[PDB]
Amino acid sequence: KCVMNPKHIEVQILGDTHGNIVHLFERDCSIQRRHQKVVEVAPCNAITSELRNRICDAAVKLMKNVDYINAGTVEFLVEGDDFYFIEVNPRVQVEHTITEMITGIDIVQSQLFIADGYALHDQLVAIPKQEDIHIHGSAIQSRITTEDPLNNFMPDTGRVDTYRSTGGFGVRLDAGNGFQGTVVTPFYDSLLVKLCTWGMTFEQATRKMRRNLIEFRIRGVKTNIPFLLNVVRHPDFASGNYNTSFIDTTPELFKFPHIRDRGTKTLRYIGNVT
């Protein structure tokens, strides 16, 4: 049965080799382009605590039942007040970042401790009891790639002549092959940098994502930033009410402003006369 207009919602788990299992709340990965995640958000601001807790408790139940060890994610589809299991990713995921940001818990450090035999709540590992693990604010992750939106999202390649990133309060960056002078190849993912922003509210985090995306300068290859900006500025996004079909059924998201490249043209002139 092909569920109609679902929210794709994922719960983060951590288990140790001593029977402790814990969830780090959920993430909303509903924003997808032809079924691939584009922007991810945590927590999901369009569900009740009551329903959030049923989903998390379900995830924990499933993973307790199998004595799951280390990091893992449980994926659900959510339709109104109902939720349905679809998948387990028995591994860390790309979008673990946002969960770290809203809970305080270093997931990758936690995987290492766990694999070395520690317990979640060992003082060194410092993960609190389930009841003491809370949501602090809201976080959004955008993956910045060389996928060119004006050319069918084909990944561009070549030397990144200018790469300048951003920072300030509420900004997290996790670099991939984004650094000034790097050569993007066509063989692997295009990912240059994962950009994440946090705020006490989703709205506060949204303002930051907008600024940061605009503030990035990347020259020598095309990026998907024009597309991310469209998503992040769209009032359906700001509302927090979107679902799996949002992108695929919102063709405004594929209209792009004309580039201002006054700089580049000026340089051609100077170059030519010189």
Partner: protein, 95 residues
């Protein structure tokens, strides 16, 4: 600080490789990157204490799916543990 993980081989590339290396360093764990021929210039390779070419001769994706060579490198470097990140071998039973 750790118990028996003194050194970690990060069996991946890119963003997640760097993520794991940073966590390792914060925990005073030594790191080993691997990189394919085609990723010789990839910046994950610069973020580890050590780095080794993996999958010589293989096509580019296959290079990071070379179980035998990855293990050779782990053993030869004295790695206590391997973090497979995501994709590649992270969900591979055999590995």
């Amino acid at each position: 600080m750790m118990n028996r993980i003194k050194k970690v081989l990060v069996a991946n590339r890119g963003e997640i490789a760097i993520r794991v290396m940073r966590a390792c360093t914060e925990l005073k764990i030594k790191t080993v990157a691997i990189y394919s021929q085609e990723d010789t210039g990839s910046f994950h390779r610069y973020k580890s204490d050590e780095a080794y070419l993996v999958g010589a001769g293989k096509k580019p994706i296959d290079a990071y799916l070379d179980i035998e060579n990855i293990i050779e490198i782990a053993k030869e470097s004295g790695a206590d543990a391997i973090h497979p990140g995501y994709g590649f071998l992270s969900e591979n039973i055999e590995f």
